[PDB]
Design a protein around this ligand. Structure first.
Ligand SMILES: Nc1ncnc2c1ncn2[C@@H]1O[C@H](COP(=O)(O)OP(=O)(O)OP(O)(O)=S)[C@@H](O)[C@H]1O
Ligand SMILES: Nc1ncnc2c1ncn2[C@@H]1O[C@H](COP(=O)(O)OP(=O)(O)OP(O)(O)=S)[C@@H](O)[C@H]1O
Ligand SMILES: Nc1ncnc2c1ncn2[C@@H]1O[C@H](COP(=O)(O)OP(=O)(O)OP(O)(O)=S)[C@@H](O)[C@H]1O
Ligand SMILES: [Mg+2]
Ligand SMILES: [Mg+2]
Ligand SMILES: [Mg+2]
Lengths: 266, 317, 405, 292, 162
DNA sequence: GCAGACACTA
């Protein structure tokens, strides 16, 4: 595999890989001829974050699944190769240096991941992280695109997300009410020995069912403003069937990047 | 630039290692078959534990020793988070080994490692038992927690006997082509008291300072061990003989009083041919003398009074 | 090759080395938990190392989850565990996944253990509809020499500060070491599984004594399996070394008072006790245990001279500033005098922990009461009398003077 | 006064002292006064030695009245100086004049700062009892392994990229080819795996690079030089290369490395120590990856 | 200048010939250094017998002008915590010698006053980093030293001066 | 090592 990109997509790529690293320390990266797949399954089995990079994201897609000899565990029949690497290892590699820019970036696999960085000047940085070829566990993607209609603006939602003091790590309550979406983020008070407040209840709400995570939602929305999308780049979507038991489905369409997210409710 | 005899002749194969013949043979079968289980080795220091582990790893790996070992020693950043991350990264890699071979991780001196690091180690072994293996090196197995000892095979190491140490001395002498004497070798063994490294150091000192290995030269360069003198003077019948022995040995050779008290306590604890009441009375007197010395009164008069009280309780008037 | 204890992992419930009463108790507790009316919010299962703790929950959740994956084991920090607990809170419907807290996060630091305690308290008192089942497994094993709880003995009572344990929504079931009969049966099962390799070498005819020694020497099934595997793989003539266990706090007092049946001679037993358990016999509030428990040798029917000598020797030992020699002398004297007077010994009394914490609590209560009395007296008028004279004169006369007036 | 010096532009002095704070902030700097100028040397654990030199023309009132062998030493604690100077030298364009004074021996190091009719005067008592003198990790130029001159900005960017990766052990590579495709890189290994930062053969950042054969006159092509250096020294030097114009690299066959920093500007020379031996037979796999 | 110092410090020996009493130890260490072989010497004895004076004279004899940057002297006056010990001695021993083709000598005065973990780290460094770096142990008390340290280090006893 | 009460088949 040899995929090279020369554009300002390094910011969105680093943001997505940082999101995946924050969700899970280990990131399972599966490469197929159709597109590029990156995901990191949660330890609690409640988070499924999917990001897809089309062939138009890069300038070349010289991938040869038939020539893979070492690591046949991750090679299964559309033949594709799957491997897992630590998120913190790669996030500190795809970072943008301060006071400098990167004009060329590519990722490759040898027969020990072969990833290199070429900045604006001639100086280049090469890294060889260790991966592990796993068993193309794409049944989660089968459930994700197994498949109401809610659409809303994303910049005010992002402002609400990053001014709500996520340090306390409260929960979010999607209150649809009647017609207007009122995004709320509060925590549930807990009783003590005799009606004591062991944990303080910090509640805040504003007006423009299901309860889901807050850092997953923030990480999913951070992908949008990171990349300047003059063309297309429509707002996020929310899909969820009846009853709170089933997980929710979200999608953020972009011309070269596909966003999916599954969060289990209750 | 000549390496010392201790480090110049470090064994590289399990055949050169002497001592516990059964354990060495078992290690050889483990290396040959390749089935390497989790192991903990404990015993007297300087008897060939870390050397045996290194030889076993070498014989099991061969050309895979470049990456297949992660030797984390005591003299390292032995924390709770960086050690866990390093071991996790070591266990999350695969190399081209035969199916009967597995990666070996060596942790010398695991006694001083923190208990949280022990729990992290247990998590790593539970998560990645199928790929990598762990080999422990230590002096005693008490400091290792029970759950970690449960997931391993314990092989206690005994002190090296006269035959193995003498055989190693003969091989090293033949390698160095050094004139020796049987009485000198007996004196070397007596001074070593089962220690291999101490015996090698004493032989090196004898050959450097005097050349020919003789009992007189060995006694001149290094004195007899103090526990033997303590045991000799403690079981003496007459008070005058014990007083003279303690004086002419310990005060003339320059032995600290607190060291004498500690050695006497160890000897009394390890004494055999004494009654329980006499042993506990002597232990109490040793504790009183130790308190007196620790406060600051550590003269010869205190030791003489301690011996006088010991002989008084022995004779019972 | 693969380890025997992993290759021979049980599949059915009958294969697990668990007692019938223990299995019934854990089954009833779990079944009570899975009803909508949750009697116990959390399940705590303490016990020694390798007494088949986690496997019980594993196969139980295997057999019960389809009735109404298997578990969600948390990998071994602070905010990661908070997020894990919050995510486990939102796993109730259509999954019914049990929450396992085996191999709990780091607690040797004060801050992380405290935040663990507040997390446990917060989840225990959460008045939220429905409940995801949760099981906590704690291994009882003391930390060797390297205070006030941790670094002395790592167990359930060390981590939890007497608040989680004293909760209605908890079922504390301590686990016992694996039975000798069950260990022998499981070792025989391994042997009849490995018949071919057993017949390969000359080990079948010398099997019964080895199995009996392994079963009677240690109570850990995993350590016994590892020892059996090492013995079978070895050609022969190799002495077997087991997983040396630990001696409990009351077990040490029982061994010191009565003695040891395995070792008749006192010197070797005392030396082994000092070597293997130096931390327990050198740490404080242990001589108090002997001083409070020596009366139960014959239900207080022995000679007064022996007791007087015992307490006098203990006073001399305390005079040596807690030196190891003092502890050795005191233990040796106690063992010697009990061995001497054990010629007529029957119906020994039960042992107890010394009443040291209650005295400290009462002293603290007296101190705060005296501080309050000084405060109110100083507010009323000018009266200072230091602190020494209060307990002798003002601790009794002033209360009755105030009450009468 | 034996030694006197005055300056008006303290920005240069404070930005030179900021390059010494990562390791030299603790104590034990041995200031030298001579006809050449003012120099500071720091050496901890006898593993790394730094020399920062101030020329005559930097000071405006350099007198240097002496009647001796013209070499006087003094040792002062850096942390006290940093704590004293942190509160002053504030704002911008404060025209803080600094006056240096030292009365030979037995007198404290005296600094006078004046800022808008407000003067300050701090006395720094010295430590000259167990001064063993001599010292210095010097190297001979007759057997230099190789010489290299690189730009300061590229080295600073490389070090600032290498620091946050980790890489507790680092390697230094030297290589020359007949087609003028000179190779110079500072690779390292960490828990992440392998980290390779490469300085290309472009003369903008690799103006001069030649590998010698231990005689400092016989330049050869096709020979590789391996330098095993600890992460600590590179981390300490990263701050010193933050502001610079040209950086000179020069180590001999003994393994000690002298790095010269140019920033007229002042000169900073730092001497390093190589590790005792390469890890097993690693150097082979360093080249095997280098032409890979 | 001299002639203004206490006689204890004024009469400090500078050469091995200036050390009296322990003729056997002096001859043995001279034979050791004549062959270029330093087997991790350990010195034990009562105070005032000339342990640190002997090691200083030996270092002067075998090095000369290299004492300023080859000998690492550690003692009770310097902090010897576990992290400090491991970092300092690892950095000193792992680094190659500058120009001299001889072993590196590290002197540890008052080695009895260290923690058990620090002693374990020191004894691991002694066996690990020993190709070019040697160790010297000075202590008047042996009960505070780990018995493993006494095995790897050759013990020399300083008798009271006759 | 102690006691108090229960397991389990001869
Ligand atoms: N059986 C043996 N045969 C030959 N040489 C031996 C033997 N045992 C020890 N030695 C020598 O003693 C040296 C030290 O051995 P080590 O294995 O380092 O000691 P140890 O058993 O690990 O105990 P430590 O290191 O004090 S915790 C080796 O390098 C050998 O030179
Ligand atoms: N018949 C058996 N019954 C129970 N466990 C068995 C049996 N045969 C093998 N084992 C193994 O023995 C171990 C027992 O697991 P547990 O003791 O429940 O784990 P644990 O509680 O974490 O042990 P510790 O205290 O952490 S060492 C597992 O690894 C099982 O696979
Ligand atoms: N063999 C000797 N002959 C003559 N003077 C000696 C001899 N040994 C020691 N001294 C004198 O003793 C002084 C102090 O001895 P040191 O060697 O510095 O201390 P020490 O003997 O090592 O004892 P400590 O407590 O371990 S520092 C020296 O300065 C000498 O004057
Ligand atoms: Mg060892
Ligand atoms: Mg388990
Ligand atoms: Mg001294």
């Amino acid at each position: 595999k040899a995929t090279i990109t020369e554009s300002g997509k390094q910011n969105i790529w680093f943001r997505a890989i940082y999101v995946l690293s924050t969700i899970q320390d280990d990131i399972k990266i599966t490469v197929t001829t159709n597109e590029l797949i990156a995901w990191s399954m949660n330890e609690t089995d409640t988070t499924l974050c999917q990001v897809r990079f089309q062939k138009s994201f890069f300038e070349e897609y010289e991938f040869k699944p038939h020539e893979i000899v070492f690591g046949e565990n991750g090679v299964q029949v559309h033949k594709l190769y799957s491997f897992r690497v630590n998120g913190r290892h790669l996030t500190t590699i795809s970072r943008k240096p301060d006071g400098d820019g990167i004009k060329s970036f590519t990722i490759a696999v040898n027969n020990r991941l072969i990833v290199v960085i070429e900045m604006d000047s001639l100086i280049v940085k090469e890294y060889c992280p260790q991966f592990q070829p796993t068993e193309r566990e794409l049944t989660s993607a089968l459930f994700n695109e197994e498949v109401n209609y809610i659409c809303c603006n994303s910049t005010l939602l992002k402002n609400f997300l990053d001014n709500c003091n996520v340090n306390v790590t409260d929960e979010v309550k999607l209150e649809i009410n009647v017609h207007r979406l009122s995004i709320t983020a509060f925590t549930k008070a807990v009783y003590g020995k005799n009606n004591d407040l062991l944990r303080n209840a910090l509640s805040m709400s504003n007006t423009i069912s299901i309860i889901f995570k807050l850092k997953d939602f923030k990480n999913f929305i951070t992908i949008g403003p990171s990349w300047k999308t003059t063309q297309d780049g429509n707002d996020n979507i929310s899909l969820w069937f009846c009853h709170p038991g089933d997980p929710i489905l979200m999608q953020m369409q972009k011309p070269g990047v596909k966003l999916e997210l599954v969060e289990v409710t209750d | 630039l000549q390496l010392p005899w201790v480090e110049k002749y470090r064994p590289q194969v399990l055949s050169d290692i002497v001592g516990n013949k059964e354990t060495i043979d078992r290690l050889q079968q483990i290396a040959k078959d390749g089935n390497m289980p989790h192991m903990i080795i404990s015993g007297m220091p300087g008897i060939g534990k870390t050397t045996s582990v290194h030889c076993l790893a070498h014989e099991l790996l061969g050309r895979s020793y470049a990456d297949g070992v992660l030797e984390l020693n005591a003299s390292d950043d032995r924390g709770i988070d960086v050690v866990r991350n390093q071991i996790k990264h070591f266990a999350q890699k695969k190399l081209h080994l035969p199916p009967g071979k597995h990666k070996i991780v060596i942790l010398d001196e695991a006694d001083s490692m923190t208990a949280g690091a022990q729990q992290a180690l247990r998590r790593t072994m539970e998560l990645y038992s199928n790929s990598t293996r762990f080999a422990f090196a230590c002096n005693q197995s008490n400091k290792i927690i029970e759950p970690l000892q449960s997931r391993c095979a314990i092989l206690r190491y005994s002190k090296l006997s006269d035959e193995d140490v003498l055989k190693r001395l003969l091989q090293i002498i033949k390698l160095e082509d050094v004139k020796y004497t049987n009485d000198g070798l007996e004196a070397i063994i007596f001074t070593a008291e089962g220690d291999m490294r101490q015996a090698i150091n004493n032989l090196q000192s004898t050959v450097a300072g005097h050349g020919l290995v003789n009992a007189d030269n060995v006694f001149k360069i290094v004195d007899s061990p103090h526990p033997l003198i303590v045991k000799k003077m403690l079981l003496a019948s007459n008070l005058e003989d014990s007083i003279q022995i303690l004086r002419t040995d310990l005060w003339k050779k320059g032995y600290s009083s607190i060291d004498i008290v500690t050695t006497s306590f160890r000897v009394t604890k390890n004494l055999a041919q004494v009654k329980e009441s006499v042993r506990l009375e002597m232990i109490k007197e040793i504790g009183l003398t130790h308190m007196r010395i620790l406060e600051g009164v550590g003269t010869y008069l205190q030791l003489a009074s301690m011996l006088a009280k010991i002989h008084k309780l022995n004779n019972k008037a | 090759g693969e380890q025997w204890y992993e290759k021979f992992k049980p599949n059915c419930l009958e294969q697990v080395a668990i007692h019938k009463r223990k299995l019934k108790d854990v089954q009833e507790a779990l079944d009570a938990m899975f009803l909508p009316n949750a009697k116990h919010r959390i399940l705590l299962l303490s016990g020694p190392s390798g007494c088949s703790k986690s496997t019980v929950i594993k196969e139980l959740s295997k057999i019960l989850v389809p009735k109404y994956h298997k578990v969600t084991e948390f990998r071994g920090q602070m905010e990661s565990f908070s997020e894990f607990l919050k995510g486990a809170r939102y796993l109730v419907m259509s999954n019914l996944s049990l929450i396992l807290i085996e191999d709990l996060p780091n607690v040797f630091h004060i801050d992380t253990r405290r935040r663990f305690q507040q997390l446990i308290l917060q989840w225990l008192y959460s008045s939220e509809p429905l409940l995801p089942p949760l099981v906590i497994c704690i291994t009882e094993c003391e930390i060797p020499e390297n205070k006030f709880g941790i670094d002395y003995t790592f167990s359930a009572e060390t981590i939890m500060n007497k608040e989680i344990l004293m909760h209605p929504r908890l079922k504390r079931i301590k686990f016992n070491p694996i039975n000798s009969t069950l260990l022998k049966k499981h070792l025989k099962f391994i042997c009849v599984q490995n018949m071919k390799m057993l017949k390969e070498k000359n080990k079948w005819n010398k099997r019964q004594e080895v199995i009996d020694y392994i079963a009677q020497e240690t109570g850990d099934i995993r350590s016994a399996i590892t020892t059996l595997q090492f013995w079978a793989t070895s050609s022969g003539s190799l002495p077997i070394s087991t997983r040396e266990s630990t001696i409990s706090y009351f077990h040490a007092i029982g061994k010191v008072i009565h003695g040891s049946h395995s070792t008749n001679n006192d010197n070797e037993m005392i030396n082994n006790l000092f070597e293997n358990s130096n931390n327990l016999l050198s740490k404080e509030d242990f001589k108090l245990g002997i001083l409070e428990n020596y009366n139960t040798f014959n239900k207080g029917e022995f000679s007064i001279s022996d007791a007087s000598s015992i307490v006098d020797c203990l006073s001399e030992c305390d005079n040596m500033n807690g030196l190891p020699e003092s502890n050795e002398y005191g233990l040796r004297e106690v063992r010697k005098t009990f061995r001497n007077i054990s010629k007529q010994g029957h119906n020994h009394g039960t042992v107890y922990f010394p009443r040291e914490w209650k005295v400290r609590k009462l002293q603290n209560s007296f101190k705060v009461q005296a501080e309050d009395w000084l405060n109110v007296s100083l507010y009323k008028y000018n009266a200072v009398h230091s602190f020494r004279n209060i307990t002798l004169e003002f601790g009794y006369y002033a209360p009755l003077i105030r009450k009468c007036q | 006064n034996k030694f006197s010096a005055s300056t008006v532009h303290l920005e240069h002095i404070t930005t030179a002292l900021s390059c010494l704070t990562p390791f030299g902030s603790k104590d034990d700097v041995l200031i030298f006064i001579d006809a050449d100028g003012l120099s500071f040397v720091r050496e901890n654990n006898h593993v790394i030695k730094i020399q920062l030199l101030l020329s005559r023309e930097l000071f405006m009132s350099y007198s240097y009245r002496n009647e001796t062998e013209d070499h006087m030493k003094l040792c002062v604690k850096i942390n006290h100086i940093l704590d004293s100077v942190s509160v002053m030298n504030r704002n911008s364009d404060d025209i803080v004049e600094c006056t240096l004074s030292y009365d030979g021996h037995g007198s404290p190091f005296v600094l006078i700062f004046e800022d808008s009719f407000i003067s300050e005067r701090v006395e720094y008592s010295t430590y000259l009892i167990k001064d063993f003198d001599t010292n210095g990790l010097e190297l001979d130029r007759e057997r230099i392994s190789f010489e290299a001159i690189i730009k300061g900005e590229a080295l600073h960017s490389a070090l600032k990229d290498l620091k946050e990766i980790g890489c507790k052990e680092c390697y230094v590579y030297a290589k020359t080819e007949a087609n003028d495709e000179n190779v110079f890189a500072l690779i390292s290994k960490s828990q992440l795996g392998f980290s390779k930062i490469k300085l290309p053969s472009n003369r903008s950042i690799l103006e001069k690079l030649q590998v010698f054969d231990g005689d400092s006159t016989t330049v050869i092509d096709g020979f590789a030089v391996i330098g095993f250096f600890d992460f600590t020294s590179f981390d300490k030097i990263r701050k010193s290369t933050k502001i610079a114009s040209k950086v000179l690299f020069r180590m001999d066959v003994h393994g000690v490395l002298s790095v010269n920093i140019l920033s007229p500007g002042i000169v900073i020379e730092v001497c390093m120590l190589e590790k005792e031996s390469i890890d097993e037979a690693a150097q082979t796999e360093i080249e095997l990856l280098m032409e890979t | 200048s001299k002639e203004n110092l206490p006689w204890v410090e004024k009469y400090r020996p500078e050469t091995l010939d200036e050390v009296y009493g322990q003729n056997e130890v002096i001859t043995t260490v001279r034979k050791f250094v004549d062959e270029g072989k330093l087997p991790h010497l350990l010195f034990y004895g009562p105070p005032g017998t000339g342990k640190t004076s002997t090691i200083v004279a030996l270092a002067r004899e075998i090095y000369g002008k290299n004492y300023s940057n080859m000998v690492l002297e550690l003692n009770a006056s310097d902090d010897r915590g576990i992290d400090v010990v491991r970092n300092q001695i690892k950095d000193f021993a792992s680094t190659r010698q500058i120009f001299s083709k001889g072993f590196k000598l590290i002197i540890l005065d008052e080695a009895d006053a260290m923690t058990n973990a620090a002693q374990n780290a020191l004894r691991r460094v002694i066996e690990r980093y020993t190709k070019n770096t040697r160790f010297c142990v000075l202590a008047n008390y042996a009960h505070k030293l780990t018995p493993a340290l006494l095995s790897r280090c050759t013990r020399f006893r300083f008798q009271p001066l006759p």
